[PDB]
């Protein structure tokens, strides 16, 4: 053998499985084909059900042997993880899991319920996606749609047929005998009907209950007509207890069969005489498998089409007699001869969706287009985002509350009379007001019709002024004092700034992502006072955007705002959660360092002071911290020398 192909997916299904079987049969001499399951039990199940021996599992020593020098990796999805030992030049043949007219992948955007998973996938594996994925397209319309919705290379497209819709034909491949699953042989029914409902938005009754409320009358009708009614629901619909109830009720039913999902229904497409479909892509699959009788059981047409935004018109790009009521569905099943799709109509739909099928395509043609493909990759840039406070810059008094102390110390001395509660208790007053505004934002997402929950300095001081009945003079004095103090206490963390600029000089993209309420111009003034160069670096400030790193939303906003083209994303920060856990959940490499902090003597010194003496104590404690920092991690002194010097000093 010369070439090596592995096939992977989360289940024994799809074009991966179809092509795997077809190659182990009709390509035993030119290719060595293996199927990598996700775990051991999956391999055991496949081997027990099929008897094949070319089945391994992920991270197996056989897999660690095959992946490093394989030739193709076939998949039905943009996998969430790829083997770290996968060869550099492998060809990821992504034979998608269906065609249709619904948006997918990057097109789902930041509002999608699946945003975090998409961001994780792409941040992790963008290099692979862009330089090693050969995406299978079936028509020019579908090719354009997929290229719009995904980040695939137009040069690596593969045009052809869906292996799962053309391999299990009458004389084709079958891993199981269909008659072993049916109460009677297929020939002993007048007609085989396949019910393929999708999962809906939401309804009081389960999808199956809304679509099939009375299974008893359905069985009566199907017995009258000697029809085999095969119920195949979306996996999410099976969680309903009504599904299990009606499944166990009709376990031995001769005319109602709840399809067992351990068997690939695609293998049985050639045995389906009628298909009751709604909004599932499988319809098109059926159309590609030769099925010609269709019933569109779409009672909730105006709750799905009016809701979702599609690329085309459902009624125009689908087929089947329209039906919107259970009673009319039964009337049709009893007294109706559903006619085959008109030749012109089938030509229309088949062009639109599987046009490239007319180019004399074949399985071997697909394998040839794959093998003869050439990877011409491009080296991609990396992304390096940086937290600001206590990462790129720090405070000359270390602790944030020192600032407030400073501000308080100015108020009481300005000559402007303030309320005692405000002066003496400024720390608690202001910090608790900030947290109050934050809770207000979090609790007013409906009233504001927005999920952004970040506050601004103006919000904090508005709360304070409107509920402490303060004059504009007092409020402006305090706010400007805080701003000027934050600016005047800035110090650079020079090593990380210089590392950021070395990265930028290497050609990488760098940016700043900070959670802070201060306005953007104040942040830029602080940065400029730390290092002027920093004024030229992109900035993602939460106050400006409304999303935060703590919730991970600011990272999603960065991903969808930039023309994300990076092979790696690294974020440098001090927060074990905002700058660590959360970004890691989004597939981002994190470098989380420790924040500056006092030790027992310095802390006790600061905690022992009242209002008059707390700020100079912050100054002296921070000088002690700077001294021990310099001694240990600048001068490189030993333990005894450092301890002697620090004692003698402090």
């Amino acid at each position: 053998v010369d070439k090596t192909w592995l096939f992977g997916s989360y289940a024994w299904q799809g074009n991966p499985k179809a092509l795997f079987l077809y190659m182990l049969v009709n390509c035993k001499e030119t290719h060595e084909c293996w199927w990598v399951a996700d775990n051991e039990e999956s391999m055991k199940s496949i081997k027990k059900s099929t008897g094949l021996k070319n089945i391994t599992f992920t991270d197996s020593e056989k897999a660690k042997e095959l992946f490093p020098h394989a030739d193709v990796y076939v998949t039905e999805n943009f996998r969430e993880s790829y083997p770290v030992y996968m060869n550099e030049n492998i060809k990821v043949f992504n034979t998608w899991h269906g065609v249709g007219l619904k948006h997918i992948e990057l097109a789902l955007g930041m509002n999608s319920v699946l945003a975090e998973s998409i961001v994780r996938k792409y941040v992790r594996n963008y290099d692979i996606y862009k330089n090693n994925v050969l995406f299978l397209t079936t028509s020019q319309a579908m090719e354009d749609h997929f290229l719009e919705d995904m980040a695939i290379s137009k040069e690596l497209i593969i045009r052809g047929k869906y292996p799962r819709n053309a391999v299990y034909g009458p004389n084709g491949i079958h891993t199981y005998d269909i008659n072993t699953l049916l109460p009677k042989n297929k020939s002993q029914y007048s007609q085989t009907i396949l019910f393929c409902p999708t999962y809906r938005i939401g309804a009081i009754q389960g999808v199956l209950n809304s679509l099939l409320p009375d299974f008893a009358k359905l069985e009566e009708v199907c017995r009258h007509k000697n029809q085999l009614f095969i119920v195949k629901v979306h996996p999410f619909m099976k969680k309903d207890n009504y599904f299990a109830e009606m499944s166990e009720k009709y376990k031995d039913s001769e005319y109602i069969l709840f399809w067992n999902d351990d068997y690939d229904i695609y293998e049985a497409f050639n045995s389906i005489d009628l298909a009751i479909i709604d909004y599932s892509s499988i319809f098109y699959d059926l159309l590609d498998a030769g099925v010609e009788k269709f019933i569109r059981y779409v009672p909730d047409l105006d709750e799905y089409q009016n809701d979702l935004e599609l690329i085309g018109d459902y009624a125009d790009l689908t087929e089947g007699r329209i039906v919107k009521s259970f009673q009319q569905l039964l009337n049709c099943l009893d007294n109706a001869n559903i006619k085959i799709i008109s030749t012109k109509r089938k030509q229309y739909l088949m062009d639109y969706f599987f046009g490239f099928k007319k180019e004399n395509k074949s399985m071997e043609s697909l394998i040839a287009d794959v093998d003869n493909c050439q990877l011409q990759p491009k080296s991609l840039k990396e992304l390096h985002t940086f937290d600001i406070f206590d990462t790129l810059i720090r405070r000359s008094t270390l602790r944030p509350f020192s600032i407030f102390d400073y501000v308080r110390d100015k108020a009481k001395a300005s000559g402007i009379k303030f309320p005692l509660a405000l002066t003496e208790n400024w720390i608690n007053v202001r910090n608790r007001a900030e947290h109050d505004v934050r809770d207000i934002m979090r609790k007013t997402t409906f009233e504001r019709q927005s999920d952004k929950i970040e506050i601004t300095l103006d919000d904090i001081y508005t709360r304070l002024q409107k509920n402490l009945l303060l004059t504009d003079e007092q409020t402006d004095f305090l706010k400007q004092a805080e701003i000027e103090a934050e600016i005047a206490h800035v110090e650079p963390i020079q090593k990380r700034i210089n590392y950021l600029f070395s990265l930028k000089a290497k050609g990488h993209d760098v940016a700043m992502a900070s959670d802070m309420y201060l306005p953007e111009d104040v942040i830029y003034k602080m940065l400029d006072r730390a290092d002027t160069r920093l004024r030229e670096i992109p900035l993602y400030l939460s106050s400006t955007i409304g999303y935060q790193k703590s919730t991970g939303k600011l990272y999603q906003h960065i991903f969808f705002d930039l023309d994300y083209q990076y092979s790696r994303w690294t974020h440098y920060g001090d927060n074990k959660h905002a700058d660590g856990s959360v970004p890691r959940r989004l597939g981002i490499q994190t470098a989380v360092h420790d924040i500056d902090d006092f030790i027992p003597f310095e802390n006790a010194m600061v905690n022992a002071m009242d209002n008059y003496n707390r700020y100079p104590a912050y100054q002296l404690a921070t000088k002690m911290h700077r001294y021990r920092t310099q001694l240990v991690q600048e001068n490189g002194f030993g333990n005894t020398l450092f301890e002697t010097k620090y004692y003698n000093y402090a």
Partner: protein, 388 residues
């Protein structure tokens, strides 16, 4: 305890209202009984120039009529009327329609009988389908315009609009105030500024609703609802008319608890306005900060355990707020829902329960996914033994 909780706040509010120029302060039903008693005592002693009046009302008596030209989308939100449904009766009641009047609109709803719990995504879909029906909107609007007659007349007869007035509550989101401001505008036919005094509220000023907050911190004061539920009559369900005059429906309760509570509160008002303070506003702020932080984070306190948590609260029958727990009661739970049914404060209830009960709760919590108990049993401090 209750004096520190209530009297400093009402002193702050009265002084702030005198400062803002308010001539009249209205105290709203239930929460305003004890608070108006306190305010009257403060005004008597300090000789302040400000009138106090009492107004009967509630969320139930004010929400439906407030739908002047539209049904609030909040009705279909996470904190709307369809939140907390447990049975079909709950759904029909939260719908404002009759059972048959409801099933006429939504025959699909006929399948909702005996639901066990009408919460979760089921309730989400229910709220959606309610929001999607214009017929429902217009029928609710008709019912609201009919029930609004008596409420408008009550407002017109009880509230002098030509004055500079304010309202004094204790805690809330601020949505009740918004509906009441809509009713005010409809009753006086103009943009009527209604300011509410709270201890705290979450929402900002919206429209004519103004909100003056005592404490500016993210604390939740629903904690003190048990006390106000000792007011000697139920929440006002609606109004009625007699002698050509509008009156609130008042179904009374026993007066013992509220009698003693008012005794204590007025003793505290006298003893609190008698303190030699250098700055009274700052002592208000300081005693309030300390007292709230104490009562909100001290579940093993003697008196928060033996008195407060024992107060009956319908929330719906007269059951304690956070009673002690027995071993078999915990043997009967498997979720946090079943335990919330037993108490409104797991920490306080556990601090009152036997050591074996606490140990059993610890044994079962990690699995049943119950909150972690991070307190110790309550130790009495004074009258530490039975005095009999």
């Amino acid at each position: 305890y209750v004096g520190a909780s209530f009297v400093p706040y009402i002193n702050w509010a009265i002084k702030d209202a005198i400062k803002r120029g308010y001539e009249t302060i209205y105290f709203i039903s239930r929460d305003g009984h004890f608070l108006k008693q306190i305010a009257d005592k403060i005004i008597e002693i300090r000789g302040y120039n400000v009138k106090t009046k009492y107004i009967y009302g509630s969320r139930k008596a004010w929400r439906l009529p407030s739908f002047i030209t539209k049904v609030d989308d909040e009705t279909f939100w996470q904190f709307g009327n369809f939140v907390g449904m447990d049975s079909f009766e709950d759904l029909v009641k939260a719908s404002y329609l009759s059972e048959s009047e409801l099933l006429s609109l939504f025959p699909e709803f006929e399948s909702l009988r005996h639901a066990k719990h009408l919460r979760g995504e089921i309730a989400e879909n229910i709220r959606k389908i309610f929001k999607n029906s214009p017929a429902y909107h217009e029928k609710v609007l008709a019912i609201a315009a009919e029930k609004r007659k008596m409420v408008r007349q009550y407002i017109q007869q009880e509230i002098n609009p030509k004055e500079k007035f304010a309202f004094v509550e204790f805690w809330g989101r601020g949505y009740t105030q918004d509906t009441f401001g809509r009713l005010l505008n409809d009753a006086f036919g103009k943009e009527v500024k209604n300011p509410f005094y709270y201890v705290r509220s979450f929402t900002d000023d919206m429209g004519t609703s103004v909100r003056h907050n005592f404490i500016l911190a993210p604390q939740n004061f629903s904690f003190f609802e048990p006390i106000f539920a000792q007011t000697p009559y139920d929440s006002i369900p609606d109004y009625y008319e007699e002698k050509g005059r509008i009156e609130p429906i008042i179904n009374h309760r026993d007066r013992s608890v509220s009698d003693l509570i008012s005794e204590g509160l007025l003793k505290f008002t006298e003893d609190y306005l008698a303190l030699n303070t250098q700055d009274e506003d700052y002592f208000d702020a300081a005693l309030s900060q300390f007292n709230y932080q104490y009562q909100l984070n001290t579940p093993n306190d003697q008196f928060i355990c033996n008195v407060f948590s024992e107060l009956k609260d319908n929330i719906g029958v007269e059951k304690p707020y956070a009673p002690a727990l027995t071993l078999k009661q915990l043997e009967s739970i498997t979720s946090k829902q079943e335990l919330d049914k037993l108490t409104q404060s797991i920490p306080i209830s556990l601090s009152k329960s036997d050591v074996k009960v606490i140990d059993y709760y610890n044994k079962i919590q990690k699995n049943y996914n119950l909150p972690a108990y991070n307190s110790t049993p309550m130790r009495k401090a004074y009258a530490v033994n039975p005095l009999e």
